[PDB]
Amino acid sequence: MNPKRIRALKSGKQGDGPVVYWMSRDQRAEDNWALLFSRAIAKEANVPVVVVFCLTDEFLEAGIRQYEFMLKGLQELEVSLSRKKIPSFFLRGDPGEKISRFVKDYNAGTLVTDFSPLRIKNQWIEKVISGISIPFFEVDAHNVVPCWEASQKHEYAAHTFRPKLYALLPEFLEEFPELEPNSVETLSDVLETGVKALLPERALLKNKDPLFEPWHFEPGEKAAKKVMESFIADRLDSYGALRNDPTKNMLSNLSPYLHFGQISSQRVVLEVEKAESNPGSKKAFLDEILIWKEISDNFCYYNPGYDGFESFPSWAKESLNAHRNDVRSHIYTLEEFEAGKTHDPLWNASQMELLSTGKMHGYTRMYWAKKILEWSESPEKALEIAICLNDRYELDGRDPNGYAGIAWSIGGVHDRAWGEREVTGKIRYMSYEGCKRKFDVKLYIEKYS
Numbered sequence: 001m002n003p004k005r006i007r008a009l010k011s012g013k014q015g016d017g018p019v020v021y022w023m024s025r026d027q028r029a030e031d032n033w034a035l036l037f038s039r040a041i042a043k044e045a046n047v048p049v050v051v052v053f054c055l056t057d058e059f060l061e062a063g064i065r066q067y068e069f070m071l072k073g074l075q076e077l078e079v080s081l082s083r084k085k086i087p088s089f090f091l092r093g094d095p096g097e098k099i100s101r102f103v104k105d106y107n108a109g110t111l112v113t114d115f116s117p118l119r120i121k122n123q124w125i126e127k128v129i130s131g132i133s134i135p136f137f138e139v140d141a142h143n144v145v146p147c148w149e150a151s152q153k154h155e156y157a158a159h160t161f162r163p164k165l166y167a168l169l170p171e172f173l174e175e176f177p178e179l180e181p182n183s184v185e186t187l188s189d190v191l192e193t194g195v196k197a198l199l200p201e202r203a204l205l206k207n208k209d210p211l212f213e214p215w216h217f218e219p220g221e222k223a224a225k226k227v228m229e230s231f232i233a234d235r236l237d238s239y240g241a242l243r244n245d246p247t248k249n250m251l252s253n254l255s256p257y258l259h260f261g262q263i264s265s266q267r268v269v270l271e272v273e274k275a276e277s278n279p280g281s282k283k284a285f286l287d288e289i290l291i292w293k294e295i296s297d298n299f300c301y302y303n304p305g306y307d308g309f310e311s312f313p314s315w316a317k318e319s320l321n322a323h324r325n326d327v328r329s330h331i332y333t334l335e336e337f338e339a340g341k342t343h344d345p346l347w348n349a350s351q352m353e354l355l356s357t358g359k360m361h362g363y364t365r366m367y368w369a370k371k372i373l374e375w376s377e378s379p380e381k382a383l384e385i386a387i388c389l390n391d392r393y394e395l396d397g398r399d400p401n402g403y404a405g406i407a408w409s410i411g412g413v414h415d416r417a418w419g420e421r422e423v424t425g426k427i428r429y430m431s432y433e434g435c436k437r438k439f440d441v442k443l444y445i446e447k448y449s
């Protein structure tokens with residue numbers, strides 16, 4: 001148990017009651033350092049470990065697709081924690097008021113949470129800390145190398161992050177010890193009432209018939225294991241050569257599970273490393289799941305304004321500002337962008353895939369966010385438009401990967417300066433003709449009418 005994984009947010013009188021794990025990011029029972037450390041703290045005090053998960057007033061900003069995925073996995077997680085003699089409690093309200101009241105009504109001895117770098121979690125922590133006196137710990141249960149330990153500053157490129165992370169990989173890439181067992185209404189009720197509130201906001205194709213297709217990704221820890229095994233056995237060999245072809249789904253499709261913490265990324269990394277495949281495909285996949293995923297936490301953790309023009313690199317701010325007054329080829333409102341009402345059939349196909357499946361191909365994720373920059377009055381409104389559609393419609397959205405990916409596409413964050421254009425300046429450019437050379441755009445457009 002590496003102590004560099006756990007940080008202290010409040011040092012108080014170490015309480016005399018159950019250690020409470022505040023699940024936020026990692027919604028799984030296996031391979032969870034926050035769950036394995038809380039048990040270790042529990043055993044050192046002879047008190048049973050418990051889990052509390054808060055259902056917040058911020059789900060109504062997303063849709064049914066995200067609400068169902070999370071709650072269905074929780075129903076499976078609740079059963080799993082029961083079989084390990086850990087009781088799971090679910091509260092519906094403000095985490096600051098709900099958690100503070102809970103630790104008092106149950107005589108919590110120690111409080112543990114998993115690590116999110118997002119602004120909304122720092123908001124919740126501010127409230128809880130001001131109303132509790134027991135010690136408050138957090139564990140990075142989502143990154144292979146803990147976010148604060150990998151780097152002490154914000155990195156400007158991946159070629160600088162890849163040595164700093166791989167030099168610490170032997171310290172932190174290791175097997176999970178098992179979760180030894182211990183010595184506010186039903187979830188189905190909450191799913192029922194939540195669906196009703198969100199229902200008249202459901203995305204609808206034309207009229208009546210809804211747009212989302214929930215049969216693409218089953219939620220839960222067990223489904224994620226089947227996904228990862230199917231990727232390694234069937235899709236890992238050709239990852240490095242086919243990841244950039246949207247006509248073929250040769251990606252791991254792990255992001256909906258990764259975002260909700262329904263499978264630990266290190267569990268993925270251990271099995272990839274031990275498996276024989278195309279060595280280049282292994283090299284390409286490991287870079288995405290270790291370098292680019294864990295640098296996204298670094299961007300969000302070390303930039304308080306990660307979702308604004310303020311966090312862009314200086315060369316990109318200077319270039320974009322010099323082109324704010326250029327004429328734009330087209331301008332679309334958010335409502336037009338949502339429905340896929342653009343003059344680009346490649347963009348409209350990309351939007352239609354997101355609406356239908358809640359997951360959009362990683363390659364077109366760059367084209368789709370750069371045309372938003374090309375068709376917006378200012379880069380600021382483009383950042384808002386890109387954030388709005390991503391968080392609303394992506395299964396894996398509302399994630400540090402999303403903001404880092406969007407900041408990469410719009411402001412060149414973790415990228416370099418390129419040849420100047422109008423409107424977009426030095427930012428990397430992706431043309432309609434360029435995508436035709438790399439993959440058969442005809443099938444992708446037809447597949448999503």
Ligand SMILES: Cc1cc2nc3c(=O)[nH]c(=O)nc-3n(C[C@H](O)[C@H](O)[C@H](O)COP(=O)(O)OP(=O)(O)OC[C@H]3O[C@@H](n4cnc5c(N)ncnc54)[C@H](O)[C@@H]3O)c2cc1C
Nearest residue numbers: 251252253254255288289292293362396397401402405406
């Ligand atoms: C503008 C934009 C927005 C994005 N929004 C999100 C998002 O909200 N949530 C999200 O999880 N990913 C986002 N992605 C990152 C990336 O596209 C997805 O991780 C990936 O496409 C998800 O599908 P996959 O699991 O089949 O990827 P795979 O090719 O199978 O890679 C596996 C994992 O590596 C990680 N990864 C892969 N590519 C990237 C990347 N470019 N940056 C960071 N991590 C990466 C992902 O965690 C991914 O799950 C975004 C990318 C861009 C360019």
